Amino acid sequence: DYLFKLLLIGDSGVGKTCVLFRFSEDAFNSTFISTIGIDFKIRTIELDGKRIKLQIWDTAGQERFRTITTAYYRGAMGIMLVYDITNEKSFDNIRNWIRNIEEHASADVEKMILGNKCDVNDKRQVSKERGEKLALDYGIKFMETSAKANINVENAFFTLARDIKAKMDKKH
Ligand SMILES: Nc1nc2c(ncn2[C@@H]2O[C@H](COP(=O)(O)OP(=O)(O)NP(=O)(O)O)[C@@H](O)[C@H]2O)c(=O)[nH]1
Ligand SMILES: [Mg+2]
């Protein structure tokens, strides 16, 4: 059945690993252990009766693997651009990521922005409408997710996968 590669991209500690863990194993680890070695996961979804194998590449947020993370753009097909709603600096840094993808990844790559840590509204620094407006500016999808609270985690991955399926099916 169909195989889609997926990139989780963002600053260190936005919750990329936790987002993949909630998608893969429907669980949450309150601990923060930074990703060093880029590791992929296969998560099988069903879109309109078709099984699609999502090869999800969980990249390291640390600056010393920027050059290493970028190398994984080849054949990526889809990229989750994750920032932390409680961290404007991470949100400011997704502009840099989106720009890097436009220049270095293929034109037909599908992009979505996730406002992660959406459950923690108390420490919110980034308004939902500021993420929506940025997504609108670049003409890409956006939704607020919580890996901890399991909000829009499946929805985000099904939304992105559909946009990849739609472009792929239209080639015929
Ligand atoms: N409240 C809350 N905390 C979250 C959520 N997602 C992740 N976190 C927390 O944020 C921290 C970083 O999560 P992690 O998945 O390791 O982030 P990362 O972006 O993969 N980090 P790195 O790029 O360095 O590997 C952890 O303490 C984790 O529990 C979420 O949806 N809600
Ligand atoms: Mg990670």
| Nearest ligand, measured from the Cα of 21 | 1
3-state secondary structure of 24: helix
3-state secondary structure of 159: helix
Strand pairing partners for 110? Answer: 78
Class of domain 1-172: alpha beta
CA distances from 51 to 15, 65, 70, 166, 167 (A): 27, 33, 29, 15, 17
Method: X-ray
User: Cα 145 to the chain's mean position, in Å?
Assistant: 10
User: From ligand 2's centre to the CA of 23, what distance in Å?
Assistant: 14
3-state secondary structure of 61: coil
Resolution of this entry, Å: 2.5
User: Cα 58 to the chain's mean position, in Å?
Assistant: 9
User: From ligand 1's centre to the CA of 49, what distance in Å?
Assistant: 32
Domain ranges of the chain: 1-172
Contact predicate 44/54, CB 8 Å: yes
| Ligand 1 in reach of 78 Cβ (< 6 A) | no
Query: In angstroms, rounded to a whole number, what is the distance separating the alpha carbons of residues 131 and 126?
Result: 7
